[PDB]
Amino acid sequence: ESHPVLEKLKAAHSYNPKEFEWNLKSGRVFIIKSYSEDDIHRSIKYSIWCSTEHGNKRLDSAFRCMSSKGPVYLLFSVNGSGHFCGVAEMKSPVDYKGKFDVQWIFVKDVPNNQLRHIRLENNDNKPVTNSRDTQEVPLEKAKQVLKIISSYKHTTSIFDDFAHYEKRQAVVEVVRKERQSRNK
Ligand SMILES: *Sc1ccccc1C(=O)NCCN1CCOCC1
């Protein structure tokens, strides 16, 4: 049983492409720390993201500075998960509490133990796996991360729980409408 939303997305997008250029000629790369799986699922299916107010202004500034002279890539992980879950390219400036277009490219779980050896000089030389939201990754270390994420032979991804997230969204909307209706 495969869900038609996911079937539609997989046919319209080339997720986890075999020929991905990790040795970037230019670009900027940022960590995104999400609060929940549900937000990741929502972002993949609608091609949008919202950071915090401060996070939005940092990504807005970076995208407009890049002026399409190179990509802005976002490396996604939810707080506490122990893996990265995909990478998207930022595709629009922030629109105002503030959302922007993203294009998901990799959707796959990469355990933190494959990336912990990469450390970020611009964040007290901490592992890239102990970053906060919108932490920027230096270009050479971004190449190392993207090469590992691109080539890692993943065993699972959020897509394996896709129908679960669909039902969760649908139930949440009905619970809210009933609750709003009882307040009137
Ligand atoms: S608005 C959006 C778009 C795509 C995926 C998730 C979301 C979302 O609703 N996020 C809610 C929590 N955010 C945390 C950071 O501050 C903004 C809201």
Author numbering: 363 to 458, 471 to 558
Question: Can you provide the manuscript's text about this entry?
Answer:
YTHDF proteins bind the N6-methyladenosine (m6A)-modified mRNAs, influencing their processing, stability, and translation. The YTH domains of YTHDF1, DF2, and DF3 share a common fold with a central β-sheet surrounded by five α-helices.
YTH co-crystal structures were determined in complexes with compounds 7, 9, and 10. The complexes with compounds 9 and 10 are identical as the disulfide in compound 10 is reduced by Cys412 returning compound 9. Compound 9 establishes the disulfide bridge with Cys412, but the thiophenyl group is oriented in the opposite direction with respect to the ebselen selenophenol. The thiophenyl is again displaced with respect to ebselen and located similarly to compound 7. Instead, the morpholine ring assumes an opposite orientation, being directed toward the m6A site and occupying the position of Trp470 in the RNA-bound structure; it establishes van der Waals interactions with Tyr397 and Thr414. Interestingly, compound 10 interacts similarly to its reduced form compound 9. Interestingly, analogues 7 and 9 occupy the same specific small pocket of ebselen but the different substituents affect the binding poses of both the selenophenyl/thiophenyl headgroups and the tail moieties. In the YTH crystallographic structures presented here, either in complex with ebselen or its analogs, an aromatic ring occupies the small pocket defined by Asp401, Arg404, Ser405, Ile410, and Trp411, which then configures as the major hotspot.
